[PDB]
Design a binder for this molecule. Structure first.
Ligand SMILES: O=c1ccn([C@H]2C[C@H](O)[C@@H](COP(=O)(O)O)O2)c(=O)[nH]1
Ligand SMILES: O=c1ccn([C@H]2C[C@H](O)[C@@H](COP(=O)(O)O)O2)c(=O)[nH]1
Ligand SMILES: [Mg+2]
Ligand SMILES: [Mg+2]
Lengths: 196, 196
């Protein structure tokens, strides 16, 4: 009966944060050690750089804290096509669910403009900003972060782990489902939820 | 057992949108007819001005679309004290739930900064931006808008209508509860939900 509501995360799922961060880092700090994408481990890139050398955490953070960083991210391959297709499905509801930096200044407005520019005004209406995704109601949350925590102990959604460089090597119990890319069968996953 | 989660709306509840809009309108359009606060009817002030004279809708909208408008709103009387007290209550969870203008440019960043400045960094962590409040999970939604609509037919929260100039005269069925101001007994309302 109900439409299936799909919460789609922004960084790592629609917007290519990892590519944008590396390219920005190499351009700004061309003499510093970097972490190639294939070597990324763990959600927070600043913490990986920090573990390489403590001051690199602040340097890498200065890249994503800069004006224009979020504005100019390239889309994840296939994301715009998939989201448009998903959005057009009957009895299917799409929201974009994104966590802004606590340093919100050059992040929150740029995320709105990114959606307007890469997807369209129609998608801006479906943006949800939150630091706690567990209080947002949906059937699915497609998100590259491995451990999603918040105040709601049993969220209404099932978390589908979207594959990204930083979570590629992560071993998950078989109860946890992954989306390998937008070319993996996200449609079937949506149908699995309609069925229950 | 559960904490009680309270969603507190921003415009009309924490931030004095109506006062700020009238003062901005009289300062910018000193020769135009205005709507005194006591005469406000209906949620959308632009539509009331528009019904007075069609071009006044665009003039009044230009006020809340201006840089600095959201940044500089004065707090609703008693709001900062009540939210701090509420936030400190045991087994009580507070989020700030606000709908940004579709013209997001001078709205979304300014709302974040407003919370940082009037409440504090600790409250910025609890901001939720959404155009659909029905998909946010809470026990209460304290909100001045009279008809809250969205995709979720039966929201998890009970809507407590926060009294504002524009909804003062609105007749509500007795099943709908109101908060007359922050000096009305919002604590008791929270206890009524803990009880169920
Ligand atoms: O190295 C990193 C990686 C991500 N983030 C923050 C940036 C975004 O604000 C937020 C992305 O969160 P998600 O919505 O993708 O969970 O994570 C960082 O601060 N540092
Ligand atoms: O005359 C008005 C009154 C309010 N709003 C918009 C401004 C805010 O973005 C939003 C406030 O929504 P709430 O979160 O308070 O429901 O309403 C207008 O566009 N015009
Ligand atoms: Mg992400
Ligand atoms: Mg309001």
């Amino acid at each position: 009966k109900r439409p299936v509501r799909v919460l789609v995360n922004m960084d790592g799922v629609l917007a290519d944060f990892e590519s944008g961060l590396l390219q920005g880092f190499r351009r700004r700090f061309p003499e510093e050690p970097h972490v190639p994408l294939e070597q990324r481990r763990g959600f927070l890139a600043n913490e990986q750089y920090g573990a390489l050398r403590p001051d690199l955490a602040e340097k890498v953070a200065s890249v994503y804290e800069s004006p224009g960083f979020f504005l100019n991210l390239e889309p994840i391959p296939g994301a715009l096509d998939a989201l448009r297709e998903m959005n057009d499905m009957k009895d299917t509801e799409v929201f974009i669910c994104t966590t802004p930096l606590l340093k919100y200044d050059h992040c929150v407005g740029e995320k709105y403009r990114w959606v307007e520019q890469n997807l369209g005004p129609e998608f801006v209406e479906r943006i949800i900003l939150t630091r706690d995704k567990t209080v947002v109601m949906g059937d699915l949350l497609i998100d590259d972060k491995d451990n999603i925590q918040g105040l709601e102990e049993t969220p209404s959604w099932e978390h589908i782990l979207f594959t990204c460089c930083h979570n590629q090597h992560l071993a998950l119990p078989p109860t946890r489902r992954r989306l390998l890319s937008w070319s993996d069968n996200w449609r079937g996953i949506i149908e699995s939820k309609r069925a229950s």
